[PDB]
Amino acid sequence: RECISIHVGQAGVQIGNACWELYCLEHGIQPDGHVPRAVFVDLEPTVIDEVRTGTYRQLFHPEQLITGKEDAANNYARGHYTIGKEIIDLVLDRIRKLADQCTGLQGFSVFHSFGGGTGSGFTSLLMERLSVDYGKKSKLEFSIYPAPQVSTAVVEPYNSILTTHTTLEHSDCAFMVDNEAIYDICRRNLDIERPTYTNLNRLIGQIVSSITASLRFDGALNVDLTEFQTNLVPYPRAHFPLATYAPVISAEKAYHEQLSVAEITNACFEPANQMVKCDPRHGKYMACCLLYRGDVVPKDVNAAIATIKTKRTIQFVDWCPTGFKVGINYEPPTVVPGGDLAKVQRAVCMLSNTTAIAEAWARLDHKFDLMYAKRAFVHWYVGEGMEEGEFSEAREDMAALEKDYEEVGVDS
Amino acid sequence: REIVHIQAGQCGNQIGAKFWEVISDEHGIDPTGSYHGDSDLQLERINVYYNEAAGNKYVPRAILVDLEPGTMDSVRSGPFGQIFRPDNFVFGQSGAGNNWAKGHYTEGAELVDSVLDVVRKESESCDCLQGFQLTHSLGGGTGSGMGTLLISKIREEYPDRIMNTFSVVPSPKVSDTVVEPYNATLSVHQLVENTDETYCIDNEALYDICFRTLKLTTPTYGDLNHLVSATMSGVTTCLRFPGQLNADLRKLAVNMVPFPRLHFFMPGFAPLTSRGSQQYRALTVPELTQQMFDAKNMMAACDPRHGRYLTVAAVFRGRMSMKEVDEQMLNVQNKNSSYFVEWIPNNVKTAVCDIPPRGLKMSATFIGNSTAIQELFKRISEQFTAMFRRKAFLHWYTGEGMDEMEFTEAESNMNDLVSEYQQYQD
Amino acid sequence: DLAECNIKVMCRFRPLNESEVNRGDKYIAKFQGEDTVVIASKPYAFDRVFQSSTSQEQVYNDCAKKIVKDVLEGYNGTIFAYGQTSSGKTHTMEGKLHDPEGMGIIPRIVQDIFNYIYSMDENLEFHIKVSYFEIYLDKIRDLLDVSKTNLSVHEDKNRVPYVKGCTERFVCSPDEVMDTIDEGKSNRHVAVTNMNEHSSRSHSIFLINVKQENTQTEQKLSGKLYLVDLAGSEKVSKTGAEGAVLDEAKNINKSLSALGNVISALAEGSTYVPYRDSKMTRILQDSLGGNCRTTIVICCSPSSYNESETKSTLLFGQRAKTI
Numbered sequence A: 001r002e003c004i005s006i007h008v009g010q011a012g013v014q015i016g017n018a019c020w021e022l023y024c025l026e027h028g029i030q031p032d033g034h035v036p037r038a039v040f041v042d043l044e045p046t047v048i049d050e051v052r053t054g055t056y057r058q059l060f061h062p063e064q065l066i067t068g069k070e071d072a073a074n075n076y077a078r079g080h081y082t083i084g085k086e087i088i089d090l091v092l093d094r095i096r097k098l099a100d101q102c103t104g105l106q107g108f109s110v111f112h113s114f115g116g117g118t119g120s121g122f123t124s125l126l127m128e129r130l131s132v133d134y135g136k137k138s139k140l141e142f143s144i145y146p147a148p149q150v151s152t153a154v155v156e157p158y159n160s161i162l163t164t165h166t167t168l169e170h171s172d173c174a175f176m177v178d179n180e181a182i183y184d185i186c187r188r189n190l191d192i193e194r195p196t197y198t199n200l201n202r203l204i205g206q207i208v209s210s211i212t213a214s215l216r217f218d219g220a221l222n223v224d225l226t227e228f229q230t231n232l233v234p235y236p237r238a239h240f241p242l243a244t245y246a247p248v249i250s251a252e253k254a255y256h257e258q259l260s261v262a263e264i265t266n267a268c269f270e271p272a273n274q275m276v277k278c279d280p281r282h283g284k285y286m287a288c289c290l291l292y293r294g295d296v297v298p299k300d301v302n303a304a305i306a307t308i309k310t311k312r313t314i315q316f317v318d319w320c321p322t323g324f325k326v327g328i329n330y331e332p333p334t335v336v337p338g339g340d341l342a343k344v345q346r347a348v349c350m351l352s353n354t355t356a357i358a359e360a361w362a363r364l365d366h367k368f369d370l371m372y373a374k375r376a377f378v379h380w381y382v383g384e385g386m387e388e389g390e391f392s393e394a395r396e397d398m399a400a401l402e403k404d405y406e407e408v409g410v411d412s
Numbered sequence B: 001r002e003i004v005h006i007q008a009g010q011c012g013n014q015i016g017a018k019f020w021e022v023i024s025d026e027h028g029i030d031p032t033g034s035y036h037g038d039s040d041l042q043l044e045r046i047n048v049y050y051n052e053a054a055g056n057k058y059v060p061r062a063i064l065v066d067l068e069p070g071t072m073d074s075v076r077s078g079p080f081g082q083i084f085r086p087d088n089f090v091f092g093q094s095g096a097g098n099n100w101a102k103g104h105y106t107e108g109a110e111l112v113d114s115v116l117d118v119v120r121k122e123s124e125s126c127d128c129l130q131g132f133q134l135t136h137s138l139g140g141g142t143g144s145g146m147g148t149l150l151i152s153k154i155r156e157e158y159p160d161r162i163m164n165t166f167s168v169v170p171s172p173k174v175s176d177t178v179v180e181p182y183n184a185t186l187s188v189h190q191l192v193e194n195t196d197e198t199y200c201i202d203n204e205a206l207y208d209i210c211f212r213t214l215k216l217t218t219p220t221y222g223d224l225n226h227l228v229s230a231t232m233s234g235v236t237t238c239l240r241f242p243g244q245l246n247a248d249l250r251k252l253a254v255n256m257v258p259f260p261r262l263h264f265f266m267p268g269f270a271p272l273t274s275r276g277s278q279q280y281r282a283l284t285v286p287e288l289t290q291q292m293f294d295a296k297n298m299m300a301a302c303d304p305r306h307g308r309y310l311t312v313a314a315v316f317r318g319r320m321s322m323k324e325v326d327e328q329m330l331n332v333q334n335k336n337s338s339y340f341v342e343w344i345p346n347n348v349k350t351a352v353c354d355i356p357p358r359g360l361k362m363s364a365t366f367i368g369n370s371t372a373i374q375e376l377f378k379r380i381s382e383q384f385t386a387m388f389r390r391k392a393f394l395h396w397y398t399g400e401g402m403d404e405m406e407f408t409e410a411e412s413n414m415n416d417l418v419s420e421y422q423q424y425q426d
Numbered sequence C: 001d002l003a004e005c006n007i008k009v010m011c012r013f014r015p016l017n018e019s020e021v022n023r024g025d026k027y028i029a030k031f032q033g034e035d036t037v038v039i040a041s042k043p044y045a046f047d048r049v050f051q052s053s054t055s056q057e058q059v060y061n062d063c064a065k066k067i068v069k070d071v072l073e074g075y076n077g078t079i080f081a082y083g084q085t086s087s088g089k090t091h092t093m094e095g096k097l098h099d100p101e102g103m104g105i106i107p108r109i110v111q112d113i114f115n116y117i118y119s120m121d122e123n124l125e126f127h128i129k130v131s132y133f134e135i136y137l138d139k140i141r142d143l144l145d146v147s148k149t150n151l152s153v154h155e156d157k158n159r160v161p162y163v164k165g166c167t168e169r170f171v172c173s174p175d176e177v178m179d180t181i182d183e184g185k186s187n188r189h190v191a192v193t194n195m196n197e198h199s200s201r202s203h204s205i206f207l208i209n210v211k212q213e214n215t216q217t218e219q220k221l222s223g224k225l226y227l228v229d230l231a232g233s234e235k236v237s238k239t240g241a242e243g244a245v246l247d248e249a250k251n252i253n254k255s256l257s258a259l260g261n262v263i264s265a266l267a268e269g270s271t272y273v274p275y276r277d278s279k280m281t282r283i284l285q286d287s288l289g290g291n292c293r294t295t296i297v298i299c300c301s302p303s304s305y306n307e308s309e310t311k312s313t314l315l316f317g318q319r320a321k322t323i
């Protein structure tokens, strides 16, 4: 029934504090109410401390807040092997101590930031140690994969080609939200050149609320977590769909809010609104899980979608007749009291697997090579319990992820 | 986390006074007083530079190494001079001769053990050690020789903790000493092989940047020092503050050093406007990157425009949009694709603290790893040969128990170091 | 300057051992031609690929014979044995020191140097000096004098590097050299609790300096041949004290990574080679790359269990892209 969550890496923790905020906010549980149902991991104390100093301070147990005073290191190796190792046990312990206390759970919603040290590496083995300790569950990892041109870390790809290959054979469904492609939404669909990280977080903090929160919440067309991976992954590769939200209108500027279904659903497939720089440049969808929430008439959907199924310029895979999982919830969304999110009475958090990422992975793989081609910051990992193996052998890994996402599509 | 500063030589020392003059105020620590901190955040992370004893006396955890009493006895007899626990003063009343050899093999080699002693008392302080800060000048005895030894020993004692080095590489135009390239070439040698992050500052790159970027007409040393100390505060201490995207020595190290040499950087501060007038506030952000990335404004002597970059780290510290930050950096990376090296898709390492420099609204330290610094070790290396060839003031070295193969060694080494760096400019 | 990067790479597979067979491992290496091995469908060509029953004699003739001639010709050279622990490095570099059939590269080299000398003995005056040291944790220890610990590399008047204070012993016969190797091997146990652990994690370096002067011609010659048995290239699986159910922390050996960068640089035809990346590469500077011949014998277990490690080894060997 439940779904634990492990927010790993400063980012996964910032986003965590955010997604965790939106929660109580739409459940009437102020600062000090019940008890969360997740944990927080980081090898840099000062960040988890922010959850220990700032807002939502006492809504957590100093037990579900793991820290390694030591060093973060923007390098996979160190975070996965060398350092990150020391903490893992302890980490697990909570996701085994928190996993017990419950009643027939469904899985762990993992929150990490692909291209980091504590986020890429660590998790790599966290999800790793999970796939074995609970192979019998769902492993949906919600990632924030590398901005297409606006990356931060100098190594980023090293850290992301490595978190992909190690987690690939362990996740159930990996959701992806592109940090940059979300900015566009903040520039083009909300207008603000002042987007603090605290915003992107409010956003995913939204799209995510549509996943677990409301879905695990009764409705006219419930959709379990398992449901996802089933209706969402055509193949064992921990396939990565993309998150998209519909009413991303500004709560100040424009106001046409009352945008009946027929509109908000069409607003999902236009590439300029998908929290991912993977513009459907060719990527044929192969399965979409349209999660609606608020006042929505099933016919409105079983029509708004029909209209789409016949737009053709939206070309769905061949081997897939119908790939539209319609998830209907009741309670409308719940916008921050005064952030910058419109606040409509219905939304569409549609996520999907698109042959599109054939790109995004490509463009991120290429990156890697360029540097590896010169070993660049390699000495930083080797000296951290890794080898020419793990790199070269994780490169070959993704290689067959560029062929995979190619074969499962583009062909009939 | 933590670090333990090291004031090698007079310069490195003189600067200590300025690095601590600053940092303290950037942490509300009065002479011997405690934390008067205008805020409450300038305290949760202080440890990085102090120690708890009394309850109002957080003492800087640095080392003051020097073979010339008068110096430390000027730093200890002035302003903040009375905050260092006397135990910190590792003096060498000997003749602090201006010979690299006199402070690395003969005179300094003795005072070393009585230093390492303390560098251990401070390291084994508490919590977890990160690395050590090292200030000095590569143009003298107590600086290049004895300080370059202090590290060769440090890096044998904790090849784990990092080693940032702040070197005052011999300014071009005019040398404030004569053997300079001797004391220098010999210390850079030791650097390229122990510390793993070096920030090279040039007394004349400063003047310039201090007489034209600060209409300042009488730039006393105190100033130069002050400007420098401003950068080393943005680097370390800063990142030991919160931030949307914070880093720390390692991130800085693990994002800036593609190849083990250690490589040297060139620090640059952001708001560098003259007092009254200039107080233009054009600091939205494009103004800071405008600054940081220009030629002038690079504490180094060489000009970036004269050689690609391998890595860059804009360590900003003042509330800004992870969008207008992450964005700007890009155009910058495209307007100058020419010089920014290609085999690194994203050279730049954007870092973002929150709280800014006490009295300012928005700043951003720049730590550049450009291939341009090739054209400096060249300089140094040249000066050597031109004088080595004739063994100029060599008797002051050998006569101090040195080797004719020692000088050969260093030059070559550091000389090769020039070579390599070009391997990327191409 | 001769050809730039005179680096040859030979891959030597050893027979599956009883432990591997007992475990149930399978022989995964497939062969093609005299220079290609196929692992997981991917082909890897090298200067030569030796199957599991290749003799010590074949390995010496193909990998070291010519280098020995160069040393006697007055040039420097280097020969390495690279691979995971138990791959066959020591068997290859030394084998059974006194068995005429089972002896490795080093015994056979010594044998050939003296034999050549014996066939000269006319106007040439020879002088052979050896040194034997190890590198552990990037620290140098003299295997001929256990008091000489943590030695440092220095460059002489003419740039030639050397290990400050390292024993240099004049040998006059094969037996003297083998005795030297035997002493070094015994001295190695000093201050070492676990020799297995120590041997797999350290690098052994044997130096043979052959000097000669033709009393009549007067032309002098000096060659240095460094024989190196490297540390295990397998960083993974480090058992001991650390994060019990949370570990993966360990880097690639400093010297191996330094060697990788040096080989890649030479393979790229780079004018700047990163020798300073390690004490090992610094000492070897005048005998690795440039106008020196270098053979790297990467050794591998043909076991299905060591598949990933073998891939790594093969990849390392590939750093020297030949044509």
Ligand SMILES: CC(=O)O[C@H]1C(=O)[C@@]2(C)[C@H]([C@H](OC(=O)c3ccccc3)[C@]3(O)C[C@H](OC(=O)[C@H](O)[C@@H](NC(=O)c4ccccc4)c4ccccc4)C(C)=C1C3(C)C)[C@]1(OC(C)=O)CO[C@@H]1C[C@@H]2O
Binding pocket: B021, B022, B023, B025, B026, B214, B223, B224, B226, B227, B229, B230, B231, B233, B234, B271, B272, B273, B274, B275, B276, B279, B356, B357, B358, B359, B360
């Ligand atoms: C009324 C007002 O706003 O005054 C400003 C001011 O006029 C200007 C010109 C300051 C001023 O700085 C200088 O004139 C200067 C003198 C010698 C060397 C270098 C700089 C200022 O003195 C410096 C001072 O800086 C700080 O307070 C920072 O926290 C800074 N502190 C120190 O350097 C410091 C100085 C004395 C004692 C202890 C610390 C800092 C910067 C980075 C990291 C840590 C601390 C500031 C904003 C000002 C004055 C006071 C006029 C500027 O410099 C800095 C470092 O902020 C020079 O260009 C900038 C722009 C500022 O607006």
Ligand SMILES: Nc1nc2c(ncn2[C@@H]2O[C@H](COP(=O)(O)OP(=O)(O)OP(=O)(O)O)[C@@H](O)[C@H]2O)c(=O)[nH]1
Binding pocket: A008, A009, A010, A011, A012, A014, A015, A043, A044, A072, A073, A074, A075, A079, A113, A115, A116, A117, A118, A119, A120, A144, A146, A147, A151, A152, A153, A179, A197, A198, A200, A201, B244, B245, B246
């Ligand atoms: N959406 C979003 N992205 C973030 C946030 N914080 C960081 N990121 C992104 O995630 C990546 C940064 O990872 P880091 O903060 O460097 O590292 P980490 O993953 O927390 O772990 P360490 O490297 O060990 O510190 C970059 O690509 C950032 O753009 C956040 O709050 N929200």
Ligand SMILES: Nc1nc2c(ncn2[C@@H]2O[C@H](COP(=O)(O)OP(=O)(O)O)[C@@H](O)[C@H]2O)c(=O)[nH]1
Binding pocket: B008, B009, B010, B011, B012, B014, B015, B096, B097, B098, B137, B139, B140, B141, B142, B143, B144, B168, B170, B171, B175, B176, B177, B203, B221, B222, B224, B225
């Ligand atoms: N920025 C700066 N440079 C200094 C200071 N003092 C000496 N220098 C520089 O240091 C070099 C001289 O070395 P010095 O510090 O006297 O050596 P030592 O005292 O014998 O170790 C010259 O290039 C000076 O410009 C200083 O307070 N600030």
Ligand SMILES: Nc1ncnc2c1ncn2[C@@H]1O[C@H](COP(=O)(O)OP(=O)(O)O)[C@@H](O)[C@H]1O
Binding pocket: C013, C014, C015, C017, C052, C083, C084, C085, C086, C087, C088, C089, C090, C091, C092, C200, C299
């Ligand atoms: N080519 C080979 N033929 C027969 N046995 C071998 C072969 N190569 C290695 N072995 C044996 O396997 C064991 C481990 O090999 P060794 O060379 O000591 O490994 P390492 O690579 O750790 O130096 C030894 O008994 C060695 O003789």
Ligand SMILES: [Mg+2]
Binding pocket: A009, A010, A011, A042, A044, A047, A072, A118
């Ligand atoms: Mg972090």
Ligand SMILES: [Mg+2]
Binding pocket: C089, C090, C199, C200
């Ligand atoms: Mg062995």
Ligand SMILES: [Zn+2]
Binding pocket: A255, A256, A257, A258
């Ligand atoms: Zn309306």
